[PDB]
Design a protein around this ligand. Sequence first.
Ligand SMILES: Cc1ncc(COP(=O)(O)O)c(C=O)c1O
Ligand SMILES: Cc1ncc(COP(=O)(O)O)c(C=O)c1O
Lengths: 357, 360
Amino acid sequence: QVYNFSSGPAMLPAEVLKLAQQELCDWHGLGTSVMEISHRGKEFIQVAEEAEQDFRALLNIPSNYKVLFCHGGGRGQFAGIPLNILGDKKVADYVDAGYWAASAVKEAKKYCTPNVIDAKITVDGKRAVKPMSEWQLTPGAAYLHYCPNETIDGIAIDETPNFGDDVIVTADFSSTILSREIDVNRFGVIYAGAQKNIGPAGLTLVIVREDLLGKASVACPSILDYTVLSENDSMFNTPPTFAWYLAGLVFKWLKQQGGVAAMDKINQQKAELLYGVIDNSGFYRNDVAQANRSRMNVPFQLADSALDKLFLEESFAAGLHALKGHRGMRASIYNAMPLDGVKTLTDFMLDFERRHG
Amino acid sequence: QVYNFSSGPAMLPAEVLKLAQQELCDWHGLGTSVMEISHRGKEFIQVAEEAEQDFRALLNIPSNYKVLFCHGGGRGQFAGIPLNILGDKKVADYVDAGYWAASAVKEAKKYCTPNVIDAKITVDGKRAVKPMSEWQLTPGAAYLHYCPNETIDGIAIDETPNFGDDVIVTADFSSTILSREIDVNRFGVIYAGAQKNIGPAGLTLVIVREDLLGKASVACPSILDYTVLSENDSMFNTPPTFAWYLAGLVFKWLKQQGGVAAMDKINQQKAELLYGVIDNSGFYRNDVAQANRSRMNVPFQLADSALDKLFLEESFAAGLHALKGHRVVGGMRASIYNAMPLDGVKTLTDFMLDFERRHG
Ligand SMILES: Cc1ncc(COP(=O)(O)O)c(C=O)c1O
Ligand SMILES: Cc1ncc(COP(=O)(O)O)c(C=O)c1O
C-alpha cells in the first residue's frame, strides 16, 4: 500500500479514484466519458448542480452565498479578490503570518496599496499568530484577507472571525476547507484551490456573499469575474469538467463518511498521533505553537539534516511518498488520508530514529 | 459503438482514454495516479517537458516561440491577449466573421479600443469571408486578431497570413489546431482551448513569439501573464496536471497516426464525405461557401426543422451523440475533430441518408 503525503496536487480518496477508473471510458452507460460530454448537456448539468448542492450542504453554506467553480487556482484568486471586490477603494488589509498570505499580498500590489498586518509572534520559543482581536484594521478598507492554513509553514488560524459588519473577511482555505466545521456567515469570500480536499488540480472553489457582486473592475477578465460567473452558474465558458466531476465524487464520498464533523474527528486523531510522535522524540522537531498547529500540513525537521536524503529515499521505498519539506519534511494528511496511513508513517519514523538517532 | 460529435468538450482518442483508464490508480509503477503527484517532481516534469517537445514537433514550432500550458480556457485568452501584448497601445484590429471572433471583440473592449473589421460576405447565396487583402488594418495597431475556425458557424479562414513585420497576427485556433500543417512563423500568438484537438477541458495552449514578452499590463493576473508563465515553464502555480498529462498522451497518439500531415488527409476525406451527402440531398442543407467550409465543425439544417427532435432522438439511439446545433443558431452540427475516425463520419452519413429515406 502506498500512502501519498503530497501537499498538492494531493491524494484523492482511494474509493473515488477507483470509481473514476471504473467509469472513465463509459460513464453512466452513455458510452462516452464524463470528460467528453457537453457542459451544457442535461447530464453534465446534473453533475455540476449536485456538486454545488453537496458542497453547500457539507459546509452548511447559507443561501446568500454563491458557490463558484472556477479556473486559475489559488493564485488566480490572489488577483480575483482585488479585481472583484475593491470597488472604488484603494486599500485592503492583508494579514501576513506565512508564505501564502505573503504571496497574496504580492499579487494585491498590482491592484491597490495593501496595508500589511504582521501577525507573526513567538511564544515561549514557538511560532504563533496574533489573535484576531489584536489585528489593527484600516477603517473603510475594502476587505480583510488572511490564510487560515499556511500549507508550507504548518500554521493554522482556527478562530472564527467576529469583526464588525463593515469588515469584509476574505480567506484562503485551500489546504483546510472541509476538514472542520466553519461559520461561513462570518465571511465575505472563502476560496480554495481544489487540489487538497476537493478534487484534482485545475479547479478552484469560491464562496462569495451575494451583496459583494456587481462592483468588479472593468479590468477583471470575465473568466475571473464573480458576477459573470454567478450569472452563468460557473459555465460562462467551458469548465474543467473532469475536475468538477471528480470534486462531485469527493463530495459524495464525504457524505458517505458522515460529512465534515466526521472528518474533523478523524483528522484530530491523525494529528494527535503524528504530533505526539514528533514531540516525544528528541530526533524530530516541530516548533509551531500548539494552538496554531495545522492538522493538515505537518512540517518537521530531523536533528541531523544530513539524514534528510536517506529519510526521503527509505520512506519512499516503504510506500510513504512525497514527504519533502520546503527549502526538513512535511507530511500532508488531508481528509483523504486514512488514520492507517499516519500510523504507517509514524511507525516508519520511530524505526528510522532507532536506526540513526 | 458510440460516435460523439460534441463540439467541446469533445471526444478523446479511444486509445488514449483506455490507456489513461488502465493507469489511473497506479501510474508508471508509482502506486499513485499521475493526478496525485507534485508538478515539480521529476516524474511530472518529464510528462510536462515531453508534452511540450511533442507539441513543438507536431506543429513544427520554431525555437523563438514559447509554448505555454495555461489555465482559463479560450475565453481566458480573450483577456490574456490584450493584457499581454497591447503594451502602451490602445488600438488593436479585430476581424469579426463569426460568433467566437465577436466574443473576442467584446472582451477586448475592457482593455482597448478594437477596430472591428467586418469580414462577412455573401457570395452566390453562400456565407464567405473577405480575403485578407480587404481587411483594412490600422497603422500602428498593437496586433491583429482573428478566428480561423468558427466552431458554431462552420466557417474556416484557411488562408495563410502574409502581412508585414509590423503586423502582429494573433489567432484563436481552438477548434482546428493540429488538423492541418500551418506556418507558425506567420503568427505572433496562436492559442487554443485544449478541449477539441489537444486534451480535456481545463487546459489551454498558447504559442507566443518570444519578442512579444516583457510588456504585460501590471493589471494582468500573474496566472495569465505570458512573461511569468514562460519564466516558470508554465508552472508559476499548480497546473491542471491531469489535463496536461492527457494532452501529452494525445500528442503521442498523433505521432502514432503519422502526425499532422496524416490527419490532414483523413480530415479531408471526412469533410468531403459529409459535405457531399449534405450537398447532394434535398433534405439537408449547409450554406457556407466552399472555400470557407470548416472541416472540423459542420453545421446543417433539415428541410423540415419540425423533424429536428426526431433526428436527435434517432441519431442518439443509433450511437451518434451530440449533433444538436448551438443554441444561438439551432439546426444540427457535426463536430468531426482529429479523434473522430472516418468510420464515424461514414456511420453518420449512412444514418442521415436512412433518416431522409424514412421521413423525407
Ligand atoms: C494556502 C494555499 N494558498 C495558495 C496555494 C496555491 O495554489 P495554486 O497552485 O492552485 O495557485 C496553495 C497550494 O497550492 C495553498 O496551499
Ligand atoms: C473558436 C473558439 N473560441 C473560443 C472558445 C471558447 O473556449 P472556452 O470555453 O475554453 O473559453 C471555443 C470553444 O469552446 C472555440 O471553439
